[PDB]
Subunit: 119 residues, 2 copies
Amino acid sequence: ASNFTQFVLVDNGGTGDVTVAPSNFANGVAEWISSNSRSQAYKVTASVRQSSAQNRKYTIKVEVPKVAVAAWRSYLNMELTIPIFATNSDCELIVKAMQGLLKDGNPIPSAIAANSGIY
Amino acid sequence: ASNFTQFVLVDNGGTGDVTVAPSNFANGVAEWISSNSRSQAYKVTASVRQSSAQNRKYTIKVEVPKVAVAAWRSYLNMELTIPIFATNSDCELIVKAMQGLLKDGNPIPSAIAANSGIY
């Protein structure tokens, strides 16, 4: 009865998609890994805290390797800070803002996916 | 001929969606803001550097306010580190991983949108 479930990290629209499965939950940090080896696996990592009096802070980390062993890993680090005063609709709005930030034709994902810069 | 264009940050599927427009580009930091007032506007902020010898590092910041003036702002901070060795297909894969991380039914956006925690 928890969110700690496997999900499709990279959706390739078929059999080639990447699925990360729950691996570990220690120190409030949930970790998903792919079925690949330790050096070949995608790694998602999420945690949340209310250490501050005003905010929930989600810490999300994604490790994207490139096939080779991994020749390299790309690291994504998200820090989402949500005031505790925020309702469910507000948090849905925040999730929509994050989703539309990386919408496929948008500036920032276009700069990232085309290796170029912003502006 | 640049990515520094307006885009729909929050896609509400109609007239209620949030659109951020290019505002400023100084110190390599592009800034989008909404048509709302300074205290009411969504604020996207993106930058990229190659200070390290191995990585491009994208820094993305989103400020989501709640209507009220803003009673509060939610802050998202993304740091995407991409090796310079990465091709266009690799960066597309990285963008897909970020997009599927926040896919609507997935663990992490479900925890965020339902105010709950991970696991």
